[PDB]
Amino acid sequence: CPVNWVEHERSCYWFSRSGKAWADADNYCRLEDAHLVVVTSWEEQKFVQHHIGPVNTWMGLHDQNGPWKWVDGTDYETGFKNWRPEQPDDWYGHGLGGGEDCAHFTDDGRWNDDVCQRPYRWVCETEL
Amino acid sequence: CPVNWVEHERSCYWFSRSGKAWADADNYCRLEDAHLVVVTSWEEQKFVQHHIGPVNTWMGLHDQNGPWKWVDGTDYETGFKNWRPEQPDDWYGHGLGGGEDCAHFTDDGRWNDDVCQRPYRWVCETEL
Numbered sequence A, B: 001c002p003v004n005w006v007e008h009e010r011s012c013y014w015f016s017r018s019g020k021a022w023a024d025a026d027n028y029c030r031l032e033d034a035h036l037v038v039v040t041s042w043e044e045q046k047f048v049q050h051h052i053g054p055v056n057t058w059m060g061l062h063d064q065n066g067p068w069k070w071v072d073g074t075d076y077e078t079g080f081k082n083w084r085p086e087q088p089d090d091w092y093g094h095g096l097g098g099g100e101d102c103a104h105f106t107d108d109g110r111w112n113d114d115v116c117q118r119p120y121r122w123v124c125e126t127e128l
């Protein structure tokens, strides 16, 4: 793993300490030949939770193009899920335009779909 | 005034129904040969409040370059102000990077400084 990245179970993680809109966070990870974090197990979810704390934080999961997709091609429907109860809900009520297309960890670790324009911290991941 | 714009006191106003980061909203208004709204009296403040309702909404006021400046050159210190109590405060505690450099109307119409990348509705203004 590069300097300032954390090794965990054959992956390297980088935890931002500033916010970006989802698309810009996604681009940032690509610059590092990485991708927004893809969570595939309870063990990994806990690890990530442990390092982000109770803070809204972008992950590599979205439905901007139709169905839910992980940024690295990992299959959504057969994959791990940790949504907050009553999420995802594609809420339009924020009034910012559109529903909600981008997933983030919430303050309790569980996932919510939110407006992709929102600035949140993010996590990059690469595999060893 | 152009179609879809509201005339008031020799100005034309356009009220968004979607959200943008401050710099994106600024670009949007400049595109229309307009500017993010510049509020210079109680009457203008009340007119804007009436149209936007209890919704966080960007205006043409910022301190990205140092001192508070209105986007059209209107002098800040000698001009109308309507800050919430204990604002502006250049808060860093949102943890998104930096302080708070962009002003918006809040739900009671009074102003707050906030993180420029937040998507809020906005208002454009042109003078007849």
Ligand SMILES: OC[C@H]1O[C@@H](O[C@H]2[C@H](O)[C@@H](O)[C@@H](O)O[C@@H]2CO)[C@H](O)[C@@H](O)[C@H]1O
Pocket (backbone or CB within 6 Å): A087, A089, A090, A091, A100, A112, A113, A114
């Ligand atoms: O109302 C739909 C939105 O809910 C927001 O989550 C709420 C949550 O439902 C509530 O129980 C409490 O925890 O406050 C949250 C507001 O921050 C979602 O964040 C939003 O995406 C919509 O789903």
Ligand SMILES: OC[C@H]1O[C@@H](O[C@H]2[C@H](O)[C@@H](O)[C@@H](O)O[C@@H]2CO)[C@H](O)[C@@H](O)[C@H]1O
Pocket (backbone or CB within 6 Å): B087, B089, B091, B100, B112, B113, B114
């Ligand atoms: O603590 C500094 C931040 O306050 C935020 O305003 C809060 C306010 O403190 C709270 O009492 C309640 O009214 O909600 C407000 C907004 O959610 C400002 O938005 C932020 O810019 C900082 O100044």
Ligand SMILES: [Ca+2]
Pocket (backbone or CB within 6 Å): A011, A037, A038, A039, A040, A044, A125
């Ligand atoms: Ca992973």
Ligand SMILES: [Ca+2]
Pocket (backbone or CB within 6 Å): A063, A090, A099, A100, A101, A102, A113
């Ligand atoms: Ca959606």
Ligand SMILES: [Ca+2]
Pocket (backbone or CB within 6 Å): A087, A088, A089, A090, A091, A100, A112, A113, A114
């Ligand atoms: Ca949601």
Ligand SMILES: [Ca+2]
Pocket (backbone or CB within 6 Å): B011, B037, B038, B039, B040, B044, B125
């Ligand atoms: Ca004006």
Ligand SMILES: [Ca+2]
Pocket (backbone or CB within 6 Å): B063, B090, B099, B100, B101, B102, B113
């Ligand atoms: Ca500031």
Ligand SMILES: [Ca+2]
Pocket (backbone or CB within 6 Å): B087, B088, B089, B090, B091, B100, B112, B113, B114
């Ligand atoms: Ca503030």
Ligand SMILES: [Cl-]
Pocket (backbone or CB within 6 Å): A118, A119, B118, B119
């Ligand atoms: Cl936001």
